[PDB]
């Protein structure tokens, strides 16, 4: 794991300089394509991309897991919805599925801890049947967190061997906005009230309880903010850990990862805490409608491209942004040159 | 023309209600897809769409024209760049071209007033060789403005007959951000300084002059803000008029139009002034990096989906947003239903 982390490559400044120059020579006023130009340059510096902005195969990895904290009344969806939706993922009827197909991306459903019988068709990496209830203790052990990080990391880089060049992260887990809020609070130093949202339509009444639960989790566990693994293990969840693992894996692999919404931001904070070298590989997608979104993003210093007021999760926003990544590549490779004004 | 305007259909509330209900029944927490849901409903109310959110063929219409105001030193690009770029449009090497191909949209290049010999391959609807210099008088006559509105309007609806269901608007015209700023100032009641930007990399030094030119145009022409045609004809340009015409045509046709950037916002203000019935057919794309963008958008009460810091024009932002429109349709038609949680 420390090996893994040690080997995350730095971005290729040489390739980025060449990219910048090329972009500057295209048939348009310099810098006129704004963020599309920056994105192209960013991609060029990613070693797994072979010195140029390009997109081969695309994959969205959905990490599914249950949380003991559901027992605290923090989620309106019944627990079984995780298991149900995960099965649905195999039939292509969910929101991510539909958006991924539209982007020509393949969806990988990964069970890292659903509290139900295994689902055929789903990738099995289950830690346990739901994680511990963070309101009364840790979600899992450090060992457990590290093992999963490792396993997902590897799974991720292996896909690279198969032509995938662009990943998207997603999750599925009733009550997951709760641990996500706790992590955000911890990493950013914000008070719980500021980052706790309505999740999947939690009634406004029910909010207070959610806030208290978050505070409780933190007080009880005393997660160390300087230790991303410590935080994940104490007040995170298997799904969150899994997302962090995709990020570490893609970075080690020298490839880009598209973030999704709120849950993904929490995982990104942990990943960057654990390995700052991860940062350059992350690409924001959309601006989640979850309350703590702004705070979370400010800490990652990211400005999403899409303002859609989305709050579904599943990696749906990631899929929706894929065409943008492809657009930056198209611009780079297909535009004519000034020299030929 | 008044006929044309009179016949713009109202949105189909019946179809929209059915759409809303269907969306609500999809396999996700209600309202979880935010703006994608709203967009789908909007599309459903458009009569040319046959009661459902759908996308058939896509077209981006680029209106090209020269402006006499270029003589005032308000643009750094040489005048010929309009003619050059317009030819380039026929070869698929420009920014819009590349982005449109990526979206599976076809680009229609329309010459409404380039100050050069006709370009083979370009649609000929030329009013004159560049419009009058707004700093010393009107851009054109009212008659001229109305005629062009009519002609473009018709051209637009005719494309509908050929399977196009979604339009994008764009332009090409050195110095065009100048008349665009004047229109914005006029319609919104903002002072020139607040809405005059750098256009295609105008040096910061050169700004003052640009502001004065705008003020001059207005003082001299005294455009009536309550009369959109009056404004267009006095302080607009052939390209701007042409964009307004696509908007009027698509609306009459009962079809959606994707806006682009700053120039497009100015044209939209005029269109809505002329015919408020046009409003429901307009769809924002991106948030232009031009200074007066925010003001312009506030007046249209539109919040763009994409924050890319783009400022190229040509209809490039419109093309980039097409996949989003298609995503809303995919969501609508392909997601599974709750009833089948
Ligand atoms: O913390 P809560 O309020 O439960 O919200 C987080 C969950 O809701 C999101 N979520 C995604 N697809 C969903 N499908 C259903 O049916 N419910 C929630 C869904 C997210 O992915 C988590 O599973
Ligand atoms: O008012 P200015 O500073 O001239 O900016 C508006 C123009 O610049 C934009 N524009 C688009 N493609 C371009 N290609 C070149 O080469 N220059 C400007 C271009 C816009 O479409 C207008 O033609
Ligand atoms: O931003 C998200 O991804 C999100 C917000 C609420 C519920 N589920 C997911
Ligand atoms: O917003 C635009 O479309 C734009 C801004 C500057 C120059 N050309 C186009």
UniProtKB/Swiss-Prot annotation, chains A, B:
Pathway connected to this protein: Nucleoside biosynthesis; alpha-ribazole biosynthesis; alpha-ribazole from 5,6-dimethylbenzimidazole: step 1/2
Effect of residue 85 to M: Alters specificity to use phenolic compounds as substrate
Gene3D superfamilies associated with the record: 1.10.1610.10, 3.40.50.10210
Keyword Transferase: yes
Enzyme class: transferase
GO molecular function terms listed in the Swiss-Prot or TrEMBL record: nicotinate-nucleotide-dimethylbenzimidazole phosphoribosyltransferase activity; nucleotide binding
Subunit details: Homodimer.
Extra remark: In vitro assays of this enzyme are performed at pH 10 because at physiological pH (7.0) its activity is undetectable; this makes it difficult to assess the role of mutagenesis of potential proton acceptor active site residues (Glu-171 and Glu-314).
Record-given protein name: Nicotinate-nucleotide--dimethylbenzimidazole phosphoribosyltransferase
Species per Swiss-Prot/TrEMBL record: Salmonella typhimurium (strain LT2 / SGSC1412 / ATCC 700720)
The encoding gene: cobT
